[PDB]
Amino acid sequence: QMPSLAPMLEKVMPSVVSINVEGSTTVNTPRMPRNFQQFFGGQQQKFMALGSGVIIDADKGYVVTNNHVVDNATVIKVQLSDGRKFDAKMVGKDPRSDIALIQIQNPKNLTAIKMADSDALRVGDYTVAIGNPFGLGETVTSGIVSALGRENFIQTDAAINRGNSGGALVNLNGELIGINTAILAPDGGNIGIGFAIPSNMVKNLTSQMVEYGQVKRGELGIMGTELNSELAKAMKVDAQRGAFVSQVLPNSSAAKAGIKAGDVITSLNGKPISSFAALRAQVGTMPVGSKLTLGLLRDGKQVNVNLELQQSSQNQVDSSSIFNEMSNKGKDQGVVVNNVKTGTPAAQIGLKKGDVIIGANQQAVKNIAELRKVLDSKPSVLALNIQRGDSTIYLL
Template structure:
């Protein structure tokens, strides 16, 4: 560690020896021909307090397969897998999006596996934070300060769908643990994907310098509005080469809204398979563009099937906003959330059509009740549907021998109230529980009967 630090010191001194004589005894000008020099400082003074540093600690658990030849000498009782636990520490950045509730958004990979999460504000105050929920595929996580903090600054969100290549950008974060750092650039490209084919990607590309530790930090426009969450860089040695990627603010907002309401992301499902439009495919279809998402299959009984989409359609817009690639369509649909009503612009046989679609929901996506209250552990919850006849929170399953089962909570129960407050959905249920400590009195609709279940 001494040699790099020494090299850095020498570089600093060398720069100082070059720069100092140029301005010795003279002040830098603040005006030219009576006009003030342009500066980002006023905007940054407003916005910077909304960007925080995040420090995490945890334990990584890894399994290593023991060779059969080694086990031969020690007998079959020797374990086939060797489990190793290694403590780790990490640094990242985050952005305050709700000052009243203490909500902070960051990247999922920043807090993944963390046992403790500490947040430091720009004024030096430190707080413990808890994970509200996250989504690994889109690399977004929502934190909440465990202690009520006063004087927080939240950032205003911009409409990232209005971004254009060439718009100015400013990246704020905590690179290499140095402390808050600001860099600037432009939007280099939009709708980038392909960094990890298993994930949901629709990145903003920027040449604003982004390095390790900037993950989870803010990418803002010149108005100080959040346009993205800095996420990844493309570089041979893990350093900045002018190609950085950020999750668009609209995509982040859709995800965090779902996390706040359900405690997790409710993945939207359109029910189509397809790919990108190549020049050969466009020529075969008589389509005069390479933009759009080509549909080669519509799944039976899916949201797309019910709306009337067909194989061979080219989806070119969602709610009037252009879609350039199938990867962009996949990312936007998945992060919009189940039950969301959207309008798709489609090219079919050269004609433009519009279809109203209500996105479906994966049957496996349900909220785990222990995320809301320990006494509900073992129950899975979801919002009720119109066919249930009641508004509330439906118990979709209860594990045998779980705390929820011990309180005689049953599958099919619909929670319509808690502690004398009516709840119509999971979002309202969560808000009530956040303000309650201790005993819960659940008003439950069970078939035609109304009962009260006390949970401690």
């Protein structure tokens, strides 16, 4: 009869799930009355998000999805394409790539998609996207590979006018080639065409979340922008062709090793650095503990140093199956906890600002994958062998 994508879609759909997130966040307190002819310029607020995800491990119930959907989640629900409902928990997330991993709680008879090799993609190749555009459900749209970046973001015309960046990008064989994302951050929604992380990168970032707790991406800990910013002018910067250092992050390697706002990096390991962009991307091709010597500019300053795990990708209330923001520290040198909060449920448990945890409630916790591997096997007695540098206490 007539050609159709329905035959492979039937072998694919069981792997695509819907995701309903419920969570809260801090919003500013509304000042009243409200005057709409007056252009001006803390409380938790519940919000609801919804997106798609792809079953990537049928046994473990591992579902890949966008970080812009599950971010700040308190409750994450998943509904299979056959209608069965499950609960899910955060296992990992990485805001850079806008990719996150979750785990269906109590999976039973699941189907996982097969991942194809991103590296074999070519522009005229056919593409099919599957997502939940406006909430009304699971929509599939078709097209082709528009641009192969060459980070290799995949570009495709199988998008959706005014809709939210769905999820799965699949080839004509039903294999996963990329997860569609949203490059319009803290928004969701597209620029006109579609951007996907390639399947090979998805596989890679995803395994890290599993086997470590987070992705090994080191940060230079500087924060800044281009040489056009109001501060590059309001501070008049000499020789403009590089990355403007607006501030050096606290307790960072850039901070520790030496550097101060103003200097404009001009190179990284000999190579020219013409824009924060160039730099932000280059430092992203280097895993923790790496050493990268870069040239700065004040009069003619330059240094060499080693970076540590970034702070963007971190964990929260999913390490201890219970409930309560740690992350990994250097190589397999335990799990270092970061900025504690105000509610202080975890600080209340004797955990400060820089407390490592090499003791797996008794054993070795070189990382959050392991640590969490124990706070899930023996939920009975828990004594966190934490040692924030000196103090080696054992709280419950």
